[PDB]
Amino acid sequence: TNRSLIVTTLLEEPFVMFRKSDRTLYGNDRFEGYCIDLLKELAHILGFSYEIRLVEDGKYGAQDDKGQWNGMVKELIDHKADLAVAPLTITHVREKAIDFSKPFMTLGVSILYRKGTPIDSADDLAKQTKIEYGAVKDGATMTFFKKSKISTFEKMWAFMSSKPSALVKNNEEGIQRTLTADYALLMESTTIEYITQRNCNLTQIGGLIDSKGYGIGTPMGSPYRDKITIAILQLQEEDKLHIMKEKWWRGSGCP
Ligand SMILES: COC(=O)CC[C@H](C[C@H](N)C(=O)O)C(=O)O
Ligand SMILES: [Cl-]
Ligand SMILES: [K+]
Ligand SMILES: [K+]
């Protein structure tokens, strides 16, 4: 098979971003970031070409009450894309719809909040309402709380899903909310690490709530899944993914 693979993705710093230039850019040249470096490395190793496209609805992917998916997950289900290359969380619920490569990065859910009120955990959030909290709508973190059998997280989901402001359109909007309101954002730990190094009034609250990985998504039965997995595992063993992360995360710290 010689054709270029269609890659669906989402803007999400520092994984996928619009490259800065004075020229009007087009095609793959528009994009840079951790996930673009990973895609280039896989493309080199495995000898394939690709065309990157932004998912129209700007969502990662979750199910509605009818069971229908949206976001990048839906793109893969409909075979509108060959690969989803993004910080896409590997979950068993999504495995009902799509396949994933093995993880290229591990992480956990944690809390992003303004330094100030010394809350120390999700339990501190769960037992009150003065500090509002939420997550990105139709993402893995939202779904984690929605499906949780943990009593504290159930309480949190009950509040989140009743407060129409709590679930934000995207990470950026969630971060802005933490900066402008008494609001704590439930979000993934490596992104929190990135944010708190650049926004010194924000901090991570508590440790990791859980453990998971980001993987490259594919339609079920993709002929590319297995070779992508092998290449990712190799890059991981040779510490190439650690170096790639250091590349995109490094910068000046905070006082
Ligand atoms: C790292 O990307 C983000 O922070 C976007 C929001 C994420 C999306 C998540 N990685 C997903 O795959 O649905 C979340 O549900 O917390
Ligand atoms: Cl929506
Ligand atoms: K080709
Ligand atoms: K430009």
Q: Cβ–Cβ contacts within 10 Å for residue 91, how many?
A: 19
**198/221 same-domain check:** no
**117/203 same-domain check:** yes
Going from the Cα of 17 to the center of ligand 4, the distance in angstroms, rounded, reads 12
Q: Which ligand is nearest to the CA of 142?
A: 1
Binding residue per annotation — 140? yes
d(CA 198, CA 248): 12
- The response to whether residue 188 sits with its C-beta less than 6 Å from ligand 1 reads yes
Burial pattern 136-147, b for ≥16 Cβ within 10 A else e, equals bbbbbbbbbbbe
Going from the Cα of 169 to the center of ligand 4, the distance in angstroms, rounded, reads 25
Token pair belonging to 74: 């839906």
Under DSSP, is residue 167 helix (H, G, I), strand (E, B) or coil? coil
Under DSSP, is residue 103 helix (H, G, I), strand (E, B) or coil? coil
**64/113 same-domain check:** no
Binding residue per annotation — 41? no
Token pair belonging to 91: 């979950």
Q: Which atom of ligand 1 is nearest to the CA of 135?
A: 16
Q: Are the C-beta atoms of residues 145 and 153 closer than 8 Å to each other?
A: yes
- The response to whether residue 87 sits with its C-beta less than 6 Å from ligand 1 reads yes
Going from the Cα of 194 to the center of ligand 1, the distance in angstroms, rounded, reads 14
The total of structural domains in the chain comes to: 2
What letter does residue 16 receive in the DSSP assignment? B
- The response to whether residue 60 sits with its C-beta less than 6 Å from ligand 1 reads yes
**135/47 same-domain check:** no
d(CA 35, CA 17): 9
Q: State the CATH number of the domain containing residue 227.
A: 3.40.190.10
Going from the Cα of 22 to the center of ligand 1, the distance in angstroms, rounded, reads 30
Q: Which of 149, 172, 146, 147 is nearest to 161 (CA)?
A: 146
Q: Are the C-beta atoms of residues 124 and 50 closer than 8 Å to each other?
A: no
Q: Which residues contact 126 (CB under 8 A, 6 or more apart)?
A: 152, 153, 155, 156, 159
C-alpha distances (whole Å) from 92 to each of 61, 97, 144, 147 are 13, 9, 11, 11
**229/148 same-domain check:** no
**41/25 same-domain check:** yes
Method by which the model was determined: X-ray
Angle separating helix axes 240-249 and 189-198, nearest 10 degrees: 40
CA 24 to chain centre: 27
Going from the Cα of 8 to the center of ligand 1, the distance in angstroms, rounded, reads 15
**77/150 same-domain check:** no
**44/117 same-domain check:** no
Prior bond of 14 cis (ω within 30°):
yes
Q: Are the C-beta atoms of residues 97 and 73 closer than 8 Å to each other?
A: yes
**Whose Cα sits closest to atom 3 in ligand 1?**
171
Token pair belonging to 200: 């010194």
Strands 5-9 and 50-54: parallel
Q: What is the 3-state secondary structure (H, E, C) of 33-101?
A: CHHHHHHHHHHHHHCCCEEEEECCCCCCCCECCCCCECHHHHHHHCCCCCEECCCCECCCCHHHCCEEC
- The response to whether residue 178 sits with its C-beta less than 6 Å from ligand 1 reads no
**9/69 same-domain check:** yes
Resolution of the experimentally solved model in angstroms: 2.0
Token pair belonging to 187: 């979000």
Q: Are the C-beta atoms of residues 35 and 85 closer than 8 Å to each other?
A: yes
Strands 212-214 and 105-107: antiparallel
C-alpha distances (whole Å) from 57 to each of 153, 198, 201 are 27, 28, 31
Last residue within a domain, chosen from 211, 231, 246: 211
Binding residue per annotation — 188? yes
**Host domain of residue 138:** 108-211
- The response to whether residue 190 sits with its C-beta less than 6 Å from ligand 1 reads no
Going from the Cα of 73 to the center of ligand 2, the distance in angstroms, rounded, reads 15
Q: What are phi and psi of 188, to 5 degrees?
A: -80, 145
**73/141 same-domain check:** no
Q: Which ligand is nearest to the CA of 26?
A: 4
**124/237 same-domain check:** no
- The response to whether residue 216 sits with its C-beta less than 6 Å from ligand 1 reads no
d(CA 143, CA 136): 10
Q: Which helix (H) or strand (E) holds 235?
A: helix 225-237
